[PDB]
Amino acid sequence: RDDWRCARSMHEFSAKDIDGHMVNLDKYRGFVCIVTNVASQXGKTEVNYTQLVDLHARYAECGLRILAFPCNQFGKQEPGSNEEIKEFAAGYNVKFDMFSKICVNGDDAHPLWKWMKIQPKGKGILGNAIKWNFTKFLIDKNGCVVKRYGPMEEPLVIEKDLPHYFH
Ligand SMILES: [Cl-]
Ligand SMILES: [Cl-]
Protein backbone atom coordinates (compact mmCIF):
# COMPACT_ATOMS: atom_id res chain seq x y z
CA ARG A 1 0.00 0.00 0.00
CA ASP A 2 2.92 2.49 -0.11
CA ASP A 3 1.77 4.42 2.99
CA TRP A 4 4.73 4.82 5.22
CA ARG A 5 2.40 5.82 8.07
CA CYS A 6 0.46 2.52 8.05
CA ALA A 7 2.86 -0.03 6.54
CA ARG A 8 4.13 -2.98 8.60
CA SER A 9 6.78 -4.33 6.13
CA MET A 10 9.04 -3.43 3.27
CA HIS A 11 6.82 -5.68 1.18
CA GLU A 12 4.04 -3.06 1.13
CA PHE A 13 6.09 -0.69 -1.01
CA SER A 14 6.95 -0.36 -4.70
CA ALA A 15 9.97 1.34 -6.23
CA LYS A 16 11.11 2.20 -9.75
CA ASP A 17 14.21 0.23 -10.72
CA ILE A 18 17.15 1.80 -12.54
CA ASP A 19 15.76 0.66 -15.92
CA GLY A 20 12.52 2.56 -15.26
CA HIS A 21 10.36 -0.38 -14.30
CA MET A 22 8.14 -0.50 -11.22
CA VAL A 23 9.00 -3.27 -8.79
CA ASN A 24 6.65 -4.46 -6.06
CA LEU A 25 8.99 -5.08 -3.14
CA ASP A 26 6.92 -8.04 -2.09
CA LYS A 27 9.17 -9.90 -4.51
CA TYR A 28 11.65 -9.90 -1.61
CA ARG A 29 9.28 -11.81 0.69
CA GLY A 30 11.30 -14.71 2.03
CA PHE A 31 14.71 -13.10 1.44
CA VAL A 32 17.16 -11.33 3.74
CA CYS A 33 17.95 -7.95 2.22
CA ILE A 34 20.38 -5.07 2.54
CA VAL A 35 18.84 -1.74 1.52
CA THR A 36 21.33 1.08 0.99
CA ASN A 37 21.61 4.57 -0.45
CA VAL A 38 24.48 4.85 -2.93
CA ALA A 39 26.52 7.53 -4.66
CA SER A 40 29.21 7.38 -7.34
CA GLN A 41 31.47 10.27 -6.21
CA UNK A 42 31.76 9.62 -2.44
CA GLY A 43 35.03 8.86 -0.68
CA LYS A 44 33.55 5.53 0.40
CA THR A 45 32.07 4.57 -3.01
CA GLU A 46 34.78 2.08 -3.84
CA VAL A 47 34.78 0.15 -0.60
CA ASN A 48 30.99 0.07 -0.40
CA TYR A 49 30.38 -1.19 -3.94
CA THR A 50 33.21 -3.72 -3.77
CA GLN A 51 32.07 -5.17 -0.44
CA LEU A 52 28.35 -5.20 -1.38
CA VAL A 53 29.24 -7.08 -4.60
CA ASP A 54 31.33 -9.51 -2.54
CA LEU A 55 28.53 -10.13 -0.04
CA HIS A 56 26.08 -10.75 -2.86
CA ALA A 57 28.48 -13.09 -4.64
CA ARG A 58 28.91 -15.21 -1.54
CA TYR A 59 25.39 -15.12 -0.09
CA ALA A 60 22.97 -14.82 -3.04
CA GLU A 61 22.72 -18.62 -2.94
CA CYS A 62 21.39 -18.35 0.65
CA GLY A 63 18.84 -15.72 -0.30
CA LEU A 64 20.72 -12.47 0.27
CA ARG A 65 19.39 -9.64 -1.88
CA ILE A 66 20.68 -6.06 -2.11
CA LEU A 67 18.57 -3.04 -3.06
CA ALA A 68 20.68 0.02 -3.95
CA PHE A 69 19.03 3.45 -4.17
CA PRO A 70 21.12 6.22 -5.73
CA CYS A 71 20.72 9.54 -3.94
CA ASN A 72 22.17 13.00 -4.66
CA GLN A 73 21.35 14.60 -1.26
CA PHE A 74 24.86 14.19 0.25
CA GLY A 75 27.43 16.54 -1.23
CA LYS A 76 25.79 16.22 -4.67
CA GLN A 77 27.78 13.00 -5.01
CA GLU A 78 25.27 11.29 -7.31
CA PRO A 79 24.76 13.92 -10.02
CA GLY A 80 24.43 11.55 -12.98
CA SER A 81 21.42 10.21 -14.82
CA ASN A 82 19.99 6.78 -14.01
CA GLU A 83 21.59 5.42 -17.20
CA GLU A 84 25.00 6.80 -16.12
CA ILE A 85 24.63 5.31 -12.64
CA LYS A 86 23.67 1.94 -14.12
CA GLU A 87 26.84 1.98 -16.22
CA PHE A 88 28.92 3.01 -13.19
CA ALA A 89 27.56 0.12 -11.10
CA ALA A 90 28.17 -2.29 -13.96
CA GLY A 91 31.87 -1.40 -13.75
CA TYR A 92 31.87 -2.92 -10.25
CA ASN A 93 30.29 -6.16 -11.53
CA VAL A 94 27.05 -5.35 -9.66
CA LYS A 95 24.48 -8.12 -10.07
CA PHE A 96 22.17 -7.03 -7.24
CA ASP A 97 19.20 -4.72 -7.78
CA MET A 98 19.81 -1.10 -8.72
CA PHE A 99 16.97 1.42 -8.37
CA SER A 100 16.26 4.81 -9.86
CA LYS A 101 17.60 7.82 -7.98
CA ILE A 102 15.50 9.03 -5.02
CA CYS A 103 15.54 11.29 -2.02
CA VAL A 104 15.96 9.61 1.36
CA ASN A 105 15.39 12.67 3.61
CA GLY A 106 12.72 15.37 3.62
CA ASP A 107 9.15 15.36 2.40
CA ASP A 108 10.07 14.01 -1.03
CA ALA A 109 11.83 11.00 0.42
CA HIS A 110 10.76 7.69 -1.07
CA PRO A 111 8.07 6.16 1.16
CA LEU A 112 10.16 3.05 1.88
CA TRP A 113 12.89 5.27 3.31
CA LYS A 114 10.42 7.30 5.39
CA TRP A 115 9.23 3.98 6.80
CA MET A 116 12.64 2.40 7.44
CA LYS A 117 13.85 5.44 9.39
CA ILE A 118 11.04 5.17 11.98
CA GLN A 119 11.37 1.43 12.68
CA PRO A 120 12.64 0.59 16.16
CA LYS A 121 15.85 -0.99 14.71
CA GLY A 122 16.03 1.68 11.97
CA LYS A 123 17.22 4.47 14.23
CA GLY A 124 20.51 6.01 13.76
CA ILE A 125 22.93 6.78 16.55
CA LEU A 126 22.01 10.45 16.57
CA GLY A 127 18.52 10.36 15.25
CA ASN A 128 16.68 9.03 12.28
CA ALA A 129 17.77 11.15 9.34
CA ILE A 130 20.09 9.52 6.83
CA LYS A 131 23.43 11.22 7.54
CA TRP A 132 25.44 10.55 4.37
CA ASN A 133 25.90 8.20 1.45
CA PHE A 134 25.96 4.44 2.17
CA THR A 135 23.69 4.01 5.12
CA LYS A 136 22.56 0.35 5.20
CA PHE A 137 19.48 -1.33 6.60
CA LEU A 138 19.29 -5.11 7.16
CA ILE A 139 15.79 -6.42 6.43
CA ASP A 140 14.59 -9.87 7.50
CA LYS A 141 12.57 -12.32 5.39
CA ASN A 142 9.37 -10.76 6.71
CA GLY A 143 10.34 -7.32 5.48
CA CYS A 144 11.10 -5.94 8.95
CA VAL A 145 14.09 -3.77 9.80
CA VAL A 146 16.61 -5.71 11.94
CA LYS A 147 19.58 -3.33 12.05
CA ARG A 148 20.97 -0.09 10.66
CA TYR A 149 24.63 0.60 9.80
CA GLY A 150 25.96 4.08 9.16
CA PRO A 151 28.05 5.64 6.41
CA MET A 152 31.26 4.80 8.21
CA GLU A 153 30.48 1.11 8.67
CA GLU A 154 31.84 -0.84 5.74
CA PRO A 155 29.45 -3.45 4.34
CA LEU A 156 31.45 -6.38 5.68
CA VAL A 157 30.43 -5.39 9.20
CA ILE A 158 26.95 -6.67 8.23
CA GLU A 159 28.32 -10.15 7.61
CA LYS A 160 28.25 -11.07 11.33
CA ASP A 161 24.54 -10.34 11.52
CA LEU A 162 23.41 -12.57 8.62
CA PRO A 163 21.68 -15.78 9.73
CA HIS A 164 23.99 -18.48 10.98
CA TYR A 165 22.79 -20.87 8.27
CA PHE A 166 24.31 -18.48 5.63
CA HIS A 167 27.75 -19.08 7.12
CL1 LIG B 1 19.81 -11.22 -6.85
CL1 LIG C 1 23.08 8.84 13.06
Give domain limits for the chain: 1-167
1-167 is classed in which CATH architecture?
3-Layer(aba) Sandwich (3.40)
Distance 33 CA to ligand 1 centre (A): 10
Q: Which ligand is nearest to the CA of 68?
A: 1
Burial, 13: exposed, middle or buried (Cβ in 10 Å; 0-12, 13-18, 19+)? buried
Pick the catalytic residue from 34, 42, 48, 122.
Answer: 42
Of the candidates 44, 43, 67, the residue with the CA atom closest to the CA atom of residue 55: 67
Measured CA to CA, the distance from residue 140 to residue 143 in angstroms comes to 5
Helix ranges (DSSP H) in 91-160: 111-118
Specify the length of the chain in residues. 167
